[PDB]
Amino acid sequence: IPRPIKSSFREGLTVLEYFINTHGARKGLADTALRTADSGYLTRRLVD
Amino acid sequence: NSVPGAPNRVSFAKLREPLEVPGLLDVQTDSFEWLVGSDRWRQAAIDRGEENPVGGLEEVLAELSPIEDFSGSMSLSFSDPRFDEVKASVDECKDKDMTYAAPLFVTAEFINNNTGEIKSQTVFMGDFPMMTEKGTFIINGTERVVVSQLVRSPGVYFDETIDKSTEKTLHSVKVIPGRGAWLEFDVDKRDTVGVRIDRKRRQPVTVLLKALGWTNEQIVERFGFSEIMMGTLEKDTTSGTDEALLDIYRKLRPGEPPTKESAQTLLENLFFKEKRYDLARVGRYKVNKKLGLNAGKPITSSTLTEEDVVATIEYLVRLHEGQTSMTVPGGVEVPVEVDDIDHFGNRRLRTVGELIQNQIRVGLSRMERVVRERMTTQDVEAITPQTLINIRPVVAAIKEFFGTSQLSQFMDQNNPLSGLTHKRRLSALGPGGLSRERAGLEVRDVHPSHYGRMCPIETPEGPNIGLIGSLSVYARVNPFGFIETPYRKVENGVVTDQIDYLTADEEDRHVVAQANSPTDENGRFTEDRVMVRKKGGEVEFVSADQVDYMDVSPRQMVSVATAMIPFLEHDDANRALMGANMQRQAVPLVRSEAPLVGTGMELRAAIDAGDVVVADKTGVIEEVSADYITVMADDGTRQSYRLRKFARSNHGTCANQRPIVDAGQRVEAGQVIADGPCTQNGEMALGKNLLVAIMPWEGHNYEDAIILSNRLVEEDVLTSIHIEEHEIDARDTKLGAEEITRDIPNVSDEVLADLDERGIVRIGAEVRDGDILVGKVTPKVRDTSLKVPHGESGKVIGIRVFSREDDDELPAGVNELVRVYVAQKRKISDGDKLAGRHGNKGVIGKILPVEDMPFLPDGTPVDIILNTHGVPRRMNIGQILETHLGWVAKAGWNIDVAAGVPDWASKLPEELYSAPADSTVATPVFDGAQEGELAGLLGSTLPNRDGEVMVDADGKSTLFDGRSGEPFPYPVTVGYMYILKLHHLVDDKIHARSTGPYSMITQQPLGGKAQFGGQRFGEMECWAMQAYGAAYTLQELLTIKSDDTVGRVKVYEAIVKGENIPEPGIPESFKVLLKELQSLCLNVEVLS
Amino acid sequence: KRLKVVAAFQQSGNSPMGMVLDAVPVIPPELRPMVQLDGGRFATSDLNDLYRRVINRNNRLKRLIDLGAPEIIVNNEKRMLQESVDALFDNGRRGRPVTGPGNRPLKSLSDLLKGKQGRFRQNLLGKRVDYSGRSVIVVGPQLKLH
Amino acid sequence: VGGLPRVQELFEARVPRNKAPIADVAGRVRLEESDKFFKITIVPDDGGE
Amino acid sequence: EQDNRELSERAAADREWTYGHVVVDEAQELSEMDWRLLMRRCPRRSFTIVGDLAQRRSPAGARSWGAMLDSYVPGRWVYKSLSVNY
Amino acid sequence: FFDELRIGLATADDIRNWSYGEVKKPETINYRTLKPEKDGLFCEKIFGPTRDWECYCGKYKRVRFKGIICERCGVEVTRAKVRRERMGHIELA
């Protein structure tokens, strides 16, 4: 997003800044089971 | 304020809220009102909108009336639904294990078209589960909540999908009603338009057009702006309507012979007959807004017509050809544009009302059938409607939705906020929704259409991430089902006070400003590069007269648990998410205390939820006890409120209420008369303010663990009450009848100490695992008594006993029922979980005596020690600021304005210039305490009892070690933080097993905390163990401990006797498998 | 594809004469248990039924072959025996299953060690190990690594 | 993006998407190129094909 | 599987290909069936036919344009000329 | 002890050998008196006894003498644990 966040968590993000920073956060909390599953699949193979 | 009894809670807010937060659970009540045509809703509609306000029952009964047969000699209609008073109150229901319902009535008229004789007859439709003032239902005694479902709106949805084989663009459309068949058009790589009906084999759309009575001249007139369409015309082996109707009937009804009339009536009663196909009213709205049809004109009732099936194609072509406009012949201009699926213009909300409507419709369809089938085989001139009618199906639908549905959920009664967020919850899963297969990662995303409509933070952390959500605070719900949020209106660069609620599509064709934008004395603007959001979720600098709207507050997108977080813009979304979902799991304490530093959002949450008691009418407190409050009002009437004492929730908590008013007091209306489980003077108190030191102690606060004083146990600060329910039924049996009594086969004579004459334990008696609560028997005779499960213990509160004889109510096969309610006061031990409102939790490692805690130069010990290592890599510093302000409050302040307000109190009100101790304050999430103000107020910080300031102007206080007595060489950040005790306790999460109950279907332990089952030993553990080379322990786990039977016996014996453990024989998973291959005549042999 | 089944019996100490059966074994009861229920009802598997069917057909066929009866009824009952035994081994593979009370196919012997409810897949999963517990962990730095 | 996909692409002996051709022989190269295409010819050092 | 051959090659290896435009120089040397093929190739009918009937060496030829085109693009084809010679 | 596992085709002699009898009746139990029937299924003579150390005759029940075949019922008296480790055959017509 070419609009950056020119504020820190010390100054305090504005409302929009705090809105466009939820996207990647939720992407992470979502992906962080598929990642585990892929690793486990590779490991299951390597073990078999 | 706007609340009569308003504990003064000063605010650092620098703006004025031009719009008071609405009722927070209206999303439920308004919808249930639309369903029963209540007069409030009827006028609310008439007051703005339409002229005939049609309800939600009226609507089904109209879309059902009249029930005719094939001939029409007779007809049977329903109308004018009525709701006569409820039988019993909410308490009477929650106690008698009964539902909160009202008799429903509807007039049923019958005609005899041969004669024409009316036989009007009022009817009894059933007892209809009604809805409480709190936004709930009460089903069979338990309190429930009908969550709202997110779905995709009916309509016509275009698309574009780069092709795979050829890397070619190719468009598609799709018409999706509430009921009917899916009609899809496409443009493929061969550049030939096509169609599919009931998702069947594909066809040239020209087939459909001609089937609709179109001649190639008509087509060439309408189309012809596109050569692909002319080509689909030429390259077609079916000319003439009837030939095309036969084509459709063939690719759609194979084996049955084509008949002219059959095909005509098929294409008629597939889309255009409003019995097998209906775009619900929202569907028609969406399909007219798009396509520019039926402009400025009713949407009363309709289904698919021809103009829409044709403008769909014109839109598809005009879009393939890459255009930005379409002006249908008669319709209006419209932008050509692909449709986003997760956009809220396209997604919509089924509220409790619509769900119940649908299930009532289902029951009514069953009733309609059953009516017909007894409407041919009866004697006319005799049949009233109450003969043709069997209401049973209806009730079942009702009783099958308020039970056996994934949207009627047991209420989250762990604390007021948990329920309040349960009721404002949006689900994208359930009957009619989706599942974890289709549920990918774009429905679980945040979309720029959620601003003011859905919270981008509140949602679970695991497999329900992004699907479940929570509705914002300033948002409401269109009658269609689309969520609206308010915006201030702006004219000529200056902002008015006219509030206009917008749904997304409207929001998208405007330039929307930001609340924190400056103004001066008028709402006018003083900057020029105003920050705005544009259509495509985009944000940018723009001019002044160029804004078409404005936001009311900064907290328009946040929710009700995320707005009770101070210093949010200083935390990160993950940790704020976790804080929110933590507050929502927080037990009620024996004594509640409100945040010394909070947000202007706890009072209103506590009111709207409903675990408090508010003055119905202004008046004067006549009498006050702990079980009753009595107000003699100003009009002469005497209201009498009753209080729930030690009331078990659905989660073991306590719902005790306690008054906060004294006799003779004069209360307004809207004033809090009693507090709840987690309120103090009407504002959420889910936790405690505790004196915290930010420092690493001697390794006992390592990796997120925490350290506590023992004053939090001595003074039962973080102590909770937990109640639990134990039920036993006494039913009949062949061998005999179960009779609950005191006497029992040979057992002790003391165990019957706490048992009264009836065999049920005696109140005020303390109990212990294995001890008896109530005595039941199955003949032989047997000892079938109820005993406390392992761990749980406490004192007998209550006994709720139901008997066949007394005739209260019971199920089938059962004759008697006893519920026991036993309580447990739980002080904060080690292993328990704590947290704060910023995503900072941790188990308790060490509970330290007060004399070894880091104490201050006042003698004041700290109460909790938190480590420095988890703060700066998690971005949850909002707790540091919280801590500082907590100090600033517990120890008041006075800015010295002798020479004038300093350069950092400029923006401050004239009410924060000073404050005494214990001075609660408010730092709203995005209009709150800045950092200069806080650094300055850390210096004022009135001295103590002895004229000394224990804390510097940086938040740091020199401390002393209670073990060495020597001071720590470096000053330490100290303050007061608001923390919370979580349902994740110890006793309810601890387990252990040596040998107990096994399955008897698999030869394994009955795996479960309730069945006293052991832990599992999966594949990965076996892998690790094999990688150690450990081979006798692995065999010990897989044979001696789980499945083997003689092995378990012999090992228990060998250990209880003291003889070395026997050695394996030959695997018993082999001594029998053999005896299966010797059965298939396989000569499996084992050899050396 | 055809050379394999022949090169097998080329060296296999055994010849293909086992594909054809002249005796058939039975399992030990504890694999076909039949137990009353706690209240008067019964609970069984469906292998005793298959063996009973086989044995009925076989004894009747024995008779038909002692009674000098025509070749046709002997032939018919022999087809029936083949069908019944093939069912017992793997009912549901060839043609139509042999349904039971509930129009359910009777669980054959292949259906005893094939699926995850099968004697092979078992012991490759979690077993609910006794002499075990679980709790919540806190930190002790007054401790040693062992 | 050569992470877990590449590991799965190797331990399973799969032909890669961006496959590169290798030299069946030693020697020198004659490199020609035309519109959107390379053509290499390996003249060996032994004196063969 | 994944060979993402360039457009020229992915196309020329397929007669079931729909182009987006078609140039034809010395187009008088073509036959009714040739144009049938071409117009089965481009359904968008976005041709740029060049030619000169009086430069024809073919006994299938055109002898006029409307002959071969009105069967595919009647009244919807433009005829421009280039009169000067330099 | 175990070193390898061989699997192969069974002959009729292998099945005649694995066995301890030859069942002939289509009888499993007596639904009335709840007892396995003779020369049928769940029999005690070729699969072993059900109650431990007692013959289906129920006479030579004491364990003090082991390794005898009660002539009446034919049930060698021993541990019932064999009813898992015991097979029989059927010499099909």
Ligand SMILES: [Zn+2]
């Ligand atoms: Zn005997």
